[PDB]
Amino acid sequence: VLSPADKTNVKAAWGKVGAHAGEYGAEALERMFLSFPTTKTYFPHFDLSHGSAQVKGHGKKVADALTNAVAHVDDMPNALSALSDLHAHKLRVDPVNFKLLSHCLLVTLAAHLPAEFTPAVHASLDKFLASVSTVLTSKYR
Amino acid sequence: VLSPADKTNVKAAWGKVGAHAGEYGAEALERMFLSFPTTKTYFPHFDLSHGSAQVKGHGKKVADALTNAVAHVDDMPNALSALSDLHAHKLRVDPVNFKLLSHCLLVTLAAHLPAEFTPAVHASLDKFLASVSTVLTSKYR
Amino acid sequence: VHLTPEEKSAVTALWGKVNVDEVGGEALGRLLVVYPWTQRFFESFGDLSTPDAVMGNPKVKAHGKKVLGAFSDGLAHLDNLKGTFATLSELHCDKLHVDPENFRLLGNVLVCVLAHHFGKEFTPPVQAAYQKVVAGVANALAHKYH
Amino acid sequence: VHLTPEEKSAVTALWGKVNVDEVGGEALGRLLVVYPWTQRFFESFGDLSTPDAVMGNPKVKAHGKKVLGAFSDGLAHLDNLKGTFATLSELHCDKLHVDPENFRLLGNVLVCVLAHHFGKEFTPPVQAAYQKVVAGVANALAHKYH
Ligand code: HEM
Ligand code: HEM
Ligand code: HEM
Numbered sequence: 001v002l003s004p005a006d007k008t009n010v011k012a013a014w015g016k017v018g019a020h021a022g023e024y025g026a027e028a029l030e031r032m033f034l035s036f037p038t039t040k041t042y043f044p045h046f047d048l049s050h051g052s053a054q055v056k057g058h059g060k061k062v063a064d065a066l067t068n069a070v071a072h073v074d075d076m077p078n079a080l081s082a083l084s085d086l087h088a089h090k091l092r093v094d095p096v097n098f099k100l101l102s103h104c105l106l107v108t109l110a111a112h113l114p115a116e117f118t119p120a121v122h123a124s125l126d127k128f129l130a131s132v133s134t135v136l137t138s139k140y141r
Numbered sequence: 142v143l144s145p146a147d148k149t150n151v152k153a154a155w156g157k158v159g160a161h162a163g164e165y166g167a168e169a170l171e172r173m174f175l176s177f178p179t180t181k182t183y184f185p186h187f188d189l190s191h192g193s194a195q196v197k198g199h200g201k202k203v204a205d206a207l208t209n210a211v212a213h214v215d216d217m218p219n220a221l222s223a224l225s226d227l228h229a230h231k232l233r234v235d236p237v238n239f240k241l242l243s244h245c246l247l248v249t250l251a252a253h254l255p256a257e258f259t260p261a262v263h264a265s266l267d268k269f270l271a272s273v274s275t276v277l278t279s280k281y282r
Numbered sequence: 283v284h285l286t287p288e289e290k291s292a293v294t295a296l297w298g299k300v301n302v303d304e305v306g307g308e309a310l311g312r313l314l315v316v317y318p319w320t321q322r323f324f325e326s327f328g329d330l331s332t333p334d335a336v337m338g339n340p341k342v343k344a345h346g347k348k349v350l351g352a353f354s355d356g357l358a359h360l361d362n363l364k365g366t367f368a369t370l371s372e373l374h375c376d377k378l379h380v381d382p383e384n385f386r387l388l389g390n391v392l393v394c395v396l397a398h399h400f401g402k403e404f405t406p407p408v409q410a411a412y413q414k415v416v417a418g419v420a421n422a423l424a425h426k427y428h
Numbered sequence: 429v430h431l432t433p434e435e436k437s438a439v440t441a442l443w444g445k446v447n448v449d450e451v452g453g454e455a456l457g458r459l460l461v462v463y464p465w466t467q468r469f470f471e472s473f474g475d476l477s478t479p480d481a482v483m484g485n486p487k488v489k490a491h492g493k494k495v496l497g498a499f500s501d502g503l504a505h506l507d508n509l510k511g512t513f514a515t516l517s518e519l520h521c522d523k524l525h526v527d528p529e530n531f532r533l534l535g536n537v538l539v540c541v542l543a544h545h546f547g548k549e550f551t552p553p554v555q556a557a558y559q560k561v562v563a564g565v566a567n568a569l570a571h572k573y574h
C-alpha cells in the first residue's frame with residue numbers, strides 16, 4: 001500500500017485522465033511494442049498496427065484493470081489476483097516486461113498531462129505501477 | 142503463498158542447513174562482496190576482511206532473519222516489516238542488491254547441499270528468497 | 283549503436299530544442315525524487331527530503347547539466363560510446379560504485395522529462411529512437427563492470 | 429586483461445573439469461525450471477510442466493551443450509565477446525525475441541550449476557571470477573538490442 005499522499009495523487013491523476021484512460025492505455029502498448037519489440041511476441045494473433053483496433057480495444061482492457069487497481073489500492077493482491085494467475089501462469093509473461101509497460105505508461109501520461117505530471121506525481125505513479133507489477137508477478141512465487 | 146510444496150521443500154532444505162545457518166549466511170555475504178563489490182559501499186566500517194568477525198557475526202543475523210521468515214512463511218510482510226524499514230529507509234539499500242545476495246545464498250547452498258539441491262529445490266528456494274526480497278523492499282512502495 | 287536514417291533525425295532534431303540547462307537537472311532531480319535510494323550518492327547536496335527542496339537544489343541543477351552534457355557527448359559519438367564514457371565509467375563504477383541498473387533508471391527518467399516537455403511531438407517512434415540511445419549510454423557507462 | 433592473472437587460472441582451470449555435456453543441459457534445464465517464463469521460447473521441445481520432464485528432456489540436453497559451447501567459445505576469446513556473439517545476438521534479438529535480462533539470468537544459473545558440482549572448490553573468489561565472464565558474455569550477447 002502507498003502513502004495516503006501517493007493515493008491522493010494517483011486517484012487525482014486518474015481523475016484527470018478519466019475518459020482518455022482507454023486511449024492512453026493503447027498508446028502505452030503501442031509505445032511498448034515499438035521501443036521494446038520483444039514484447040510483441042506475447043501478442044501473436046494481435047495485428048499490432050497503429051490504429052489496430054485489437055490494440056486499442058485492449059488498451060482499454062488494461063486501463064480498466066488499472067482503474068480497478070486504484071479502487072482497491074488498499075488491497076491489490078486480491079483485486080488483481082485474477083490477472084496474476086493469467087499473466088504469470090497461463091501467459092508466462094517475462095517479469096522484466098511489466099516494468100517496460102509501466103515506464104511506457106508514464107511516458108504516456110507525461111506526454112498528455114504537461115503541468116499535471118510533477119515530480120511528486122511521477123513518483124506516486126511509478127510507485128503505484130510498481131505495486132501493480134509486484135502483484136501481477138506474485139504468481140511466480 | 143508459494144505452493145505447500147515449495148514450503149515443504151524450503152523448510153526441508155532449511156532443516157538440512159540447520160546448524161550451518163550462521164556459517165552459510167556469512168559465506169553468502171563474502172561471496173556477494175567479492176562478485177559484486179558495489180555492495181561494499183553499504184559497509185564502510187565493517188570494512189570486510191576475509192574471516193572478519195564483523196561478517197561472521199553478521200552472516201548470523203541474516204540467517205536468523207531468514208529462519209524467522211521460514212517460520213512465518215505466510216506472513217513475511219509482518220514477520221519482516223521490521224527489516225523492511227531498516228533496509229528500505231535508514232540504510233537505503235538499492236533493491237538490485239536484494240537480488241544479488243539471494244543468488245549468492247543459492248550459490249552458497251549449492252556448494253554445500255550437493256544432492257539435496259535439486260532443480261525442484263533450487264526453484265522452491267529462489268522462489269522463497271524472492272518473496273523475502275519483495276518484502277524487504279516493500280518500504281519503497 | 284543503431285539509429286536508422288529517420289531515427290537519427292528525430293533524435294538529433296529533438297535534442298536541438300532541448301533547454302540544455304533545464305532537462306539536465308530535472309532528470310537528476312526526478313531520479314532523486316522517484317527512486318529515493320539514489321539520494322545516498324548525493325548527500326553532500328543537502329536536504330532532499332522534499333521534492334521541492336530537491337528540484338530547486340542549486341547542486342542538482344549544476345551537476346544536472348553536467349550529465350545532460352555527457353548525453354549530448356553521446357549523440358556525437360553514437361558509434362563509440364564504448365570509449366566516450368570510459369573514464370566516466372571508472373568514476374561511477376570504480377570510484378562511486380553506482381550499481382549499473384541505475385544508469386538505465388536515469389535514462390528512462392530523461393525520457394520522461396522529454397516526453398514531459400515535448401508533449402505530443404514526442405511520438406512513440408521518437409521515444410523508441412531515444413530508448414535506444416539511453417540503452418547504449420547506460421551500457422557504455424557500465425563498461426567497467428561487465 | 430578482462431580478468432587478473434589469478435582470476436584467469438581459477439576460471440580456465442575450473443572449466444577444465446566440466447562435463448562439457450552435463451553442465452550445459454543442467455543450466456538450461458534449471459533456467460527453464462526456475463524461471464518458467466523462459467519456457468515460452470522452447471515450446472517446440474515438448475512438455476515442460478514437471479522439473480523431471482524438463483531436465484531429462486533430450487532437446488534440453490542437446491541444445492544445452494550447444495550453449496555451454498558458446499560459453500567455452502567466450503572463455504577462449506575473453507577479448508571480443510562483442511563480435512564473438514554478434515550473429516548469435518541478432519538471432520536471439522531479431523528472431524527468438526529473448527529479453528536480454530535473461531542472458532544474465534542464465535549466466536547465474538550456470539554459476540549455480542558449477543557451485544553445485546564443484547562444491548567447495550568453488551570458493552567465493554572463483555565465483556567472482558566467473559561472475560565477470562558471465563557478466564560479459566551476457567552483455568556481448570545483448571549488444572544488438574541497442
Ligand atoms: C500494469 C500491467 C498490466 C496490466 C494492468 C495488464 C492487464 C491486462 C488485462 C486487463 C488483460 C485482459 C485479461 C482478461 O482477459 O481478463 C490483459 C491480457 C493480457 N496481457 Fe496484460 N497487463 C499488464 C501487463 C502486461 C505485460 C507486461 C504483457 C506483455 C509483454 C502483457 C500481456 C498480456 C497478454 C498477451 C494478455 C492476453 C491478451 C489477449 O490475447 O487477448 N500484459 N492484460
Ligand atoms: C537476504 C536478505 C537480507 C536479510 C534477511 C537481511 C537482514 C539483516 C539484519 C537482520 C540486519 C541486522 C539488524 C540489526 O542490526 O539488528 C541487517 C543489517 C544490514 N544489512 Fe541486511 N539483510 C538482507 C539483505 C541485505 C542486502 C541485499 C544488503 C545489501 C548490500 C544489506 C545490507 C545491510 C547493512 C548495511 C546492514 C547494516 C550493518 C550494521 O551496521 O549492523 N542487507 N541485515
Ligand atoms: C545515464 C548515465 C549517467 C550519466 C550520463 C552520468 C553522468 C555524470 C557526469 C557527466 C558526471 C560529472 C563528472 C564529474 O564532474 O565528476 C557524473 C558524476 C556523478 N554521477 Fe553520474 N551519470 C549517470 C548516472 C548516474 C546514476 C544512476 C547515479 C546514481 C544515482 C549517478 C551518480 C553520480 C555521482 C554521485 C557523481 C558525482 C557528482 C559530484 O559530486 O560531482 N550518476 N555523472
Ligand code: HEM
Nearest residue numbers: 466469470491494495498499524526530531534565566569
Ligand atoms: C546468454 C547465454 C546464451 C547462450 C550463449 C546461448 C546460445 C545459443 C546458441 C548458440 C543457439 C543456436 C544453436 C541452437 O539452437 O542450439 C541458441 C539458440 C536458442 N536460444 Fe540461446 N543462448 C543463451 C541464452 C538464451 C536465453 C536466455 C534464452 C531463453 C529465453 C535463449 C533462447 C534461445 C532459443 C529460442 C534458441 C533456439 C533453440 C532451438 O529451437 O533449436 N537463449 N542459443
